Amino acid sequence: VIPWQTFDETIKELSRFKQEYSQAASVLVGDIKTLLMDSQDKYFEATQTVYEWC
Protein backbone atom coordinates (compact mmCIF):
# COMPACT_ATOMS: atom_id res chain seq x y z
CA VAL A 1 0.00 0.00 0.00
CA ILE A 2 3.04 2.32 0.39
CA PRO A 3 5.44 1.92 -2.58
CA TRP A 4 8.72 2.77 -0.90
CA GLN A 5 11.01 0.55 -2.98
CA THR A 6 10.01 2.15 -6.29
CA PHE A 7 10.52 5.55 -4.63
CA ASP A 8 14.05 4.57 -3.58
CA GLU A 9 14.88 3.19 -7.04
CA THR A 10 13.71 6.47 -8.59
CA ILE A 11 15.77 8.61 -6.19
CA LYS A 12 18.91 6.52 -6.75
CA GLU A 13 18.50 6.55 -10.53
CA LEU A 14 18.11 10.34 -10.56
CA SER A 15 21.11 10.62 -8.23
CA ARG A 16 23.42 8.40 -10.30
CA PHE A 17 22.99 10.56 -13.44
CA LYS A 18 24.35 13.59 -11.61
CA GLN A 19 27.34 11.71 -10.16
CA GLU A 20 28.23 10.39 -13.62
CA TYR A 21 28.17 13.77 -15.31
CA SER A 22 30.02 15.53 -12.47
CA GLN A 23 32.80 12.94 -12.68
CA ALA A 24 32.88 13.33 -16.46
CA ALA A 25 32.90 17.14 -16.56
CA SER A 26 35.42 17.75 -13.75
CA VAL A 27 38.24 15.78 -15.39
CA LEU A 28 37.75 17.57 -18.70
CA VAL A 29 37.67 21.06 -17.16
CA GLY A 30 40.84 20.24 -15.19
CA ASP A 31 42.52 19.12 -18.42
CA ILE A 32 41.56 22.43 -20.06
CA LYS A 33 43.03 24.27 -17.03
CA THR A 34 46.34 22.44 -17.53
CA LEU A 35 46.32 23.23 -21.27
CA LEU A 36 45.69 26.95 -20.71
CA MET A 37 48.55 27.20 -18.21
CA ASP A 38 50.90 25.37 -20.62
CA SER A 39 49.93 27.77 -23.40
CA GLN A 40 50.66 30.77 -21.19
CA ASP A 41 54.14 29.39 -20.40
CA LYS A 42 54.88 28.90 -24.12
CA TYR A 43 53.64 32.42 -24.89
CA PHE A 44 55.87 33.93 -22.18
CA GLU A 45 58.94 32.07 -23.43
CA ALA A 46 58.45 33.05 -27.09
CA THR A 47 57.82 36.75 -26.44
CA GLN A 48 60.70 36.93 -23.94
CA THR A 49 63.09 35.42 -26.51
CA VAL A 50 62.05 37.98 -29.14
CA TYR A 51 62.29 40.83 -26.56
CA GLU A 52 65.86 39.84 -25.66
CA TRP A 53 66.87 39.68 -29.32
CA CYS A 54 65.36 43.11 -30.09
Binding site: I2, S15, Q23, A25, K33, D38, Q48, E52
Partner: protein, 151 residues
Protein backbone atom coordinates in the same frame (compact mmCIF):
# COMPACT_ATOMS: atom_id res chain seq x y z
CA UNK B 1 50.43 22.96 -14.57
CA UNK B 2 49.18 19.39 -14.12
CA UNK B 3 48.64 19.69 -10.36
CA UNK B 4 46.88 23.02 -10.81
CA UNK B 5 44.28 21.26 -12.99
CA UNK B 6 43.96 18.25 -10.70
CA UNK B 7 43.20 20.72 -7.91
CA UNK B 8 40.29 22.27 -9.85
CA UNK B 9 38.96 18.83 -10.78
CA UNK B 10 39.00 17.86 -7.10
CA UNK B 11 37.30 21.06 -5.92
CA UNK B 12 34.35 20.82 -8.32
CA UNK B 13 33.71 17.14 -7.49
CA UNK B 14 33.87 18.06 -3.80
CA UNK B 15 31.21 20.76 -4.11
CA UNK B 16 28.90 18.46 -6.10
CA UNK B 17 29.22 15.37 -3.89
CA UNK B 18 28.57 17.42 -0.75
CA UNK B 19 25.16 18.46 -2.09
CA UNK B 20 24.35 14.88 -3.07
CA UNK B 21 25.17 13.70 0.46
CA UNK B 22 23.06 16.54 1.86
CA UNK B 23 20.07 15.27 -0.14
CA UNK B 24 20.79 11.62 0.77
CA UNK B 25 20.52 12.66 4.43
CA UNK B 26 17.01 14.09 4.07
CA UNK B 27 15.80 11.14 2.04
CA UNK B 28 17.14 8.78 4.72
CA UNK B 29 15.60 10.55 7.75
CA UNK B 30 12.12 10.08 6.24
CA UNK B 31 12.84 6.37 5.74
CA UNK B 32 13.74 6.02 9.43
CA UNK B 33 10.51 7.80 10.41
CA UNK B 34 8.46 5.64 8.02
CA UNK B 35 9.88 2.40 9.43
CA UNK B 36 9.49 3.47 13.07
CA UNK B 37 5.97 4.87 12.96
CA UNK B 38 4.77 2.07 10.69
CA UNK B 39 6.13 -0.60 13.02
CA UNK B 40 4.73 1.12 16.10
CA UNK B 41 1.19 0.75 14.71
CA UNK B 42 1.47 -3.05 15.08
CA UNK B 43 0.97 -2.69 18.82
CA UNK B 44 -2.73 -3.44 18.41
CA UNK B 45 -2.22 -7.15 19.11
CA UNK B 46 -2.66 -5.96 22.70
CA UNK B 47 -5.02 -3.20 23.82
CA UNK B 48 -4.43 0.57 23.78
CA UNK B 49 -1.82 -0.08 26.49
CA UNK B 50 0.11 -1.91 23.78
CA UNK B 51 -0.47 1.05 21.45
CA UNK B 52 0.83 3.78 23.76
CA UNK B 53 3.75 1.58 24.83
CA UNK B 54 4.75 1.31 21.16
CA UNK B 55 4.31 4.95 20.13
CA UNK B 56 6.09 6.16 23.27
CA UNK B 57 9.14 3.98 22.54
CA UNK B 58 9.11 4.93 18.85
CA UNK B 59 8.74 8.69 19.33
CA UNK B 60 11.18 8.65 22.23
CA UNK B 61 14.04 6.73 20.67
CA UNK B 62 13.68 8.13 17.14
CA UNK B 63 12.96 11.77 17.94
CA UNK B 64 15.17 11.94 21.02
CA UNK B 65 18.25 9.99 20.09
CA UNK B 66 18.56 8.98 16.43
CA UNK B 67 17.64 12.11 14.42
CA UNK B 68 19.81 14.50 16.55
CA UNK B 69 22.73 12.07 16.22
CA UNK B 70 22.32 12.05 12.44
CA UNK B 71 22.18 15.86 12.47
CA UNK B 72 25.44 16.02 14.44
CA UNK B 73 27.06 13.68 11.91
CA UNK B 74 25.91 15.94 9.06
CA UNK B 75 27.32 19.02 10.84
CA UNK B 76 30.65 17.18 11.10
CA UNK B 77 30.57 16.55 7.33
CA UNK B 78 29.87 20.27 6.74
CA UNK B 79 32.86 21.37 8.83
CA UNK B 80 35.07 18.85 7.00
CA UNK B 81 33.95 20.30 3.64
CA UNK B 82 34.83 23.84 4.75
CA UNK B 83 38.30 22.78 5.95
CA UNK B 84 39.13 20.95 2.72
CA UNK B 85 37.94 23.90 0.61
CA UNK B 86 40.31 26.19 2.52
CA UNK B 87 43.16 23.70 1.96
CA UNK B 88 42.58 23.69 -1.82
CA UNK B 89 42.29 27.50 -1.83
CA UNK B 90 45.67 27.79 -0.09
CA UNK B 91 47.38 25.35 -2.48
CA UNK B 92 46.30 27.52 -5.44
CA UNK B 93 47.93 30.59 -3.85
CA UNK B 94 51.17 28.69 -3.22
CA UNK B 95 51.38 27.53 -6.85
CA UNK B 96 50.63 31.02 -8.21
CA UNK B 97 53.25 32.68 -5.99
CA UNK B 98 55.92 30.16 -7.04
CA UNK B 99 55.19 30.72 -10.75
CA UNK B 100 55.30 34.51 -10.37
CA UNK B 101 58.66 34.28 -8.59
CA UNK B 102 60.13 32.15 -11.39
CA UNK B 103 58.98 34.40 -14.25
CA UNK B 104 60.23 37.54 -12.47
CA UNK B 105 63.65 35.93 -12.13
CA UNK B 106 63.67 34.93 -15.84
CA UNK B 107 63.07 38.57 -16.84
CA UNK B 108 65.75 39.79 -14.41
CA UNK B 109 68.33 37.37 -15.86
CA UNK B 110 67.42 38.40 -19.42
CA UNK B 111 68.21 42.02 -18.62
CA UNK B 112 71.79 40.90 -17.86
CA UNK B 113 72.03 38.63 -20.90
CA UNK B 114 71.11 41.47 -23.29
CA UNK B 115 74.02 43.62 -22.08
CA UNK B 116 76.42 40.67 -22.16
CA UNK B 117 75.50 39.94 -25.79
CA UNK B 118 75.84 43.62 -26.77
CA UNK B 119 79.32 43.82 -25.22
CA UNK B 120 80.32 40.56 -26.94
CA UNK B 121 79.36 42.05 -30.31
CA UNK B 122 81.21 45.31 -29.60
CA UNK B 123 84.39 43.27 -28.98
CA UNK B 124 84.20 42.10 -32.64
CA UNK B 125 85.19 45.53 -34.03
CA UNK B 126 88.81 44.62 -33.05
CA UNK B 127 89.29 48.02 -31.38
CA UNK B 128 89.83 47.95 -27.62
CA UNK B 129 89.90 51.75 -27.32
CA UNK B 130 86.47 52.16 -28.92
CA UNK B 131 84.32 54.34 -26.65
CA UNK B 132 81.21 52.27 -27.32
CA UNK B 133 82.85 49.14 -25.86
CA UNK B 134 84.24 51.11 -22.89
CA UNK B 135 80.76 52.41 -22.10
CA UNK B 136 79.21 48.95 -22.49
CA UNK B 137 81.77 47.49 -20.06
CA UNK B 138 81.13 50.28 -17.54
CA UNK B 139 77.41 49.52 -17.84
CA UNK B 140 77.93 45.79 -17.24
CA UNK B 141 79.96 46.50 -14.08
CA UNK B 142 77.01 48.36 -12.53
CA UNK B 143 74.53 45.70 -13.68
CA UNK B 144 76.58 42.90 -12.09
CA UNK B 145 77.06 44.85 -8.86
CA UNK B 146 73.31 45.48 -8.60
CA UNK B 147 72.61 41.79 -9.18
CA UNK B 148 75.04 40.84 -6.42
CA UNK B 149 73.51 43.44 -4.11
CA UNK B 150 70.03 42.00 -4.68
CA UNK B 151 71.17 38.42 -3.99
Amino acid sequence: NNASGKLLALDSQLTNDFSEKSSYFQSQVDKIRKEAYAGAAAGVVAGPFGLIISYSIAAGVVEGKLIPELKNKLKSVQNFFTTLSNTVKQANKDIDAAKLKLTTEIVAIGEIKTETETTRFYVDYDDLMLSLLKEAAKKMINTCNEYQKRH
